Amino acid sequence: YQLTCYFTNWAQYRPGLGRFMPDDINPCLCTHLIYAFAGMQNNEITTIEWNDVTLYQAFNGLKNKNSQLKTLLAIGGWNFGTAPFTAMVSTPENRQTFITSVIKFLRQYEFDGLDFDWEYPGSRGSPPQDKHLFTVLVQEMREAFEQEAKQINKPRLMVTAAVAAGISNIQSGYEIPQLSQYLDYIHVMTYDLHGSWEGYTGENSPLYKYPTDTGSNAYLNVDYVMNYWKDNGAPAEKLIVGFPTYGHNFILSNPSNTGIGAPTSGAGPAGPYAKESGIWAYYEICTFLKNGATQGWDAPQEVPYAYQGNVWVGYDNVKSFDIKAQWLKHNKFGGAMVWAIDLDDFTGTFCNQGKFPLISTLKKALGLQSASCTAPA
Ligand SMILES: N=C(N)N1CCN(c2ccc(Cl)cc2)CC1
């Protein structure tokens, strides 16, 4: 199994114990590390943060401590939008300009591949022709990668994609059987399945449906989404299940109504470290629990939640990650990806479950605890 962990270049700006640098990554923890995010200018891949180049060096330098470790650079993200992707795929000339820049960029800075985080083809401004043009881009990139590898006599660069979990987003975004042929890995974003935008409490990444999930809401769980991707053309061995190391919090409209489906009046408070409205890092949730929040267990969905006063949070813990991992193995998927390494209790001082308690749970469950970890010669 693969254990693929996303690192974010804005975690460096968090205060105190929240600050996370590439050198805070345990090089022996994950099999793949992905750098988020890269940007685009004039149809060419570029940096986003002022010090990205310095961080690439330290990020990719982790491979000097683990000979098996592979690294990828993720382009796009939520704030990046669709517009630069649309303009890039719209002509064959722009696609070539992009692919060329990617090959040069990844080789220069020592990445082993590219991760597409276009959110999404066919939606959020992206016109309907982008569904097929994304497949075209991926195919062209894969083929360019195969040719380059032979000309320079080095291992082929990987091409992977972070993909939607929402069925409507999937249906208008991806030609699954064709796209699956060219992608090395398919990183399914099985999270943000519920949140405050809905107007009631729900889970970030529930494994199964809640009994009250009716109609299209019955699709808002990990099991359904992963099986949708599989039943519609994606090989199970290529499919990578998305694991969140954060939860979504809510302001409860009635503090005495604390279950699943309880009415909410908006997003929960930003945490003191990530400072994301409606989102708490796992280590921020641990603080919530230590300060006296009531532990809940969403039994049908195999995920925890917690509440105190008018604040309710739905998230993942050690138990739920372990349950999901056994499910993953039974279903014989390619492995797990993690958003994000910097959101797990990396110091171990928040949750008292060891360093990286959530990702370590996956490393152990997926049979990677004994996997070789030696510096390259
Ligand atoms: N890819 C996305 N559409 N999303 C998943 C990750 N999301 C997030 C953002 C900030 C923190 Cl601290 C934790 C999670 C932002 C929305």
CATH at residue 72: 3.20.20.80
Asked which of 315, 336, 358 is the last residue of a domain, the reply is: 315
Residue with tokens 């491979």: 63
Helix extents (H) in the chain? 52-60, 83-89, 92-109, 130-152, 167-173, 176-182, 222-231, 282-290, 318-330, 357-365
Question: Are 93 and 11 in a shared domain?
Answer: yes
Question: Are 220 and 325 in a shared domain?
Answer: yes
CA atoms within 13 A on the CB side of 299: 0
How many structural domains compose the chain?
2
List, in order, residues 6 or more apart from 160 with CB less than 8 Å away: 72, 113, 114, 115, 116, 183, 184, 185, 186, 187
Which of 239, 354, 254, 358 is CA-nearest to residue 307? Answer: 254
Residue 110 falls in the annotated catalytic set: no
State the resolution, in angstroms. Answer: 2.1
Question: Are 206 and 188 in a shared domain?
Answer: yes
Three-state secondary structure call for residue 280: strand
In sequence order, the β-bridge partners of residue 114 are 73, 159
Contact 303, 318 (CB under 8 A): no
Rounded Cα gap, residues 313 and 205, in angstroms: 12
Residue with tokens 């989102």: 279
Cβ-based neighbour number of residue 222 at 10 Å: 26
Q: What is the CATH number of the domain that holds 281?
A: 3.10.50.10
**What is the extent of the structural domain holding 333?**
1-244+316-377
Burial code (b: 16+ CB inside 10 Å, e: under 16) for 243-256 equals bbbbbbbbbbeeee
Question: Are 13 and 91 in a shared domain?
Answer: yes
Rounded Cα gap, residues 278 and 265, in angstroms: 12
Distances (CA, A) of 219 to 45, 108, 198, 337: 35, 42, 15, 20
Question: Are 202 and 271 in a shared domain?
Answer: no
Residue ID of nearest Cα to ligand 1 atom 6: 339
Which of 102, 205, 220, 121 is CA-nearest to residue 163? Answer: 121
Contact 83, 120 (CB under 8 A): no
Cβ-based neighbour number of residue 51 at 10 Å: 11
Question: Are 256 and 240 in a shared domain?
Answer: no
Question: Are 1 and 121 in a shared domain?
Answer: yes
Residue ID of nearest Cα to ligand 1 atom 5: 192
First-residue to last-residue Cα distance in the chain: 25
In sequence order, the β-bridge partners of residue 339 are 244
Question: Are 327 and 280 in a shared domain?
Answer: no
Question: Are 254 and 296 in a shared domain?
Answer: yes
Q: Which atom of ligand 1 is nearest to the CA of 77?
A: 1
Question: Are 345 and 310 in a shared domain?
Answer: no
The residue to mutate among 280, 339, 358, having the most atoms of ligand 1 within 8 angstroms of its beta carbon, is 339
Question: Are 302 and 163 in a shared domain?
Answer: no
Contact 180, 234 (CB under 8 A): yes
